[PDB]
Design a protein around this ligand. Structure first.
Ligand SMILES: Nc1ncnc2c1ncn2[C@@H]1O[C@H](CSCC[C@H](N)C(=O)O)[C@@H](O)[C@H]1O
Lengths: 6, 225
């Protein structure tokens, strides 16, 4: 799924 | 690093860690989307607009008889994108719990799901001359570079005339980034295009998803055949 930019 | 071969030290553990992760995720839309269920409708609406072009505008229009949902999970996309547009849909996913829940989640329209295949995409062979549209969303990061290319090649052999494959996924800023929690990779535009073009598929369309939250990786859709 959609993910926070690490 | 620019490939999975470099970021994936143990390919066997890259796959087993991901299977373990998904096996205990709740079979819900928030589980499918890592807490981003609030963008599901925005995502589906753009996917529909992206897909309706190949289905409405001739010549060589894409048919509407059957679609394959790859990495389908509980059927979020099958329910709101594919079933309203295709007579029948097949689903494939590695996680048994999601396929079982899909029967409940899809409701009455789920009776038009023909097969619930339980398989890793790296081991899955879609049947030749079966699908007008093969939809691959938020799952390509779970395959190695080589397995992705080979899977796309097998998908090509399963398309009906004028059929298309669609990939919709996160794109990294640069190179290949590994996510240690769910055991997946994120690749930049150049890496993905090279995997696709280099595997013998033609890139027909490419579109960045607009209106997404600021804090997440960019998302792109690709149409190929
Ligand atoms: N190797 C693999 N082969 C097939 N499915 C896999 C896989 N690795 C992870 N998955 C599946 O990939 C899905 C990612 S969540 C995405 C679900 C769906 N594409 C949607 O957008 O709503 C999960 O259902 C998980 O079970």
């Amino acid at each position: 799924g959609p993910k926070r930019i690490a | 690093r620019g490939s999975t071969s470099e970021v994936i030290e143990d390919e066997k553990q890259f796959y087993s860690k991901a299977k373990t992760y998904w096996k205990q995720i709740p079979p819900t839309v928030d589980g499918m989307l890592g807490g981003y269920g609030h963008i599901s409708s925005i995502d589906i609406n753009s996917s529909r607009k992206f897909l309706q072009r190949f289905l409405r505008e001739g010549p060589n229009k894409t048919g509407t008889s059957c679609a394959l949902d790859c990495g389908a999970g509980i059927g979020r996309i099958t329910k709101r994108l594919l079933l309203p547009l295709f007579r029948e849909v097949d689903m494939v996913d590695i996680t048994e719990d999601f396929l079982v829940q899909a029967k409940t989640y899809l409701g009455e329209e789920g009776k038009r799901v023909r097969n619930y295949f339980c398989c890793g995409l790296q081991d899955f062979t879609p049947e030749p001359d079966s699908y007008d549209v093969i939809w691959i969303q938020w799952v390509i990061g779970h395959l190695t570079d080589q397995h992705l290319a080979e899977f796309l090649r097998r998908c090509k052999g399963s398309l009906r005339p004028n059929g298309i494959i669609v990939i919709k996924d996160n794109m990294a800023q640069e190179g290949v980034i590994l996510d240690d929690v769910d055991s997946s990779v994120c690749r930049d535009l150049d890496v993905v295009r090279r995997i696709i073009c280099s595997a013998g598929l033609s890139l027909l369309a490419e579109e960045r998803q607009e209106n997404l939250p600021d804090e997440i990786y960019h998302v792109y859709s690709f149409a190929l055949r």
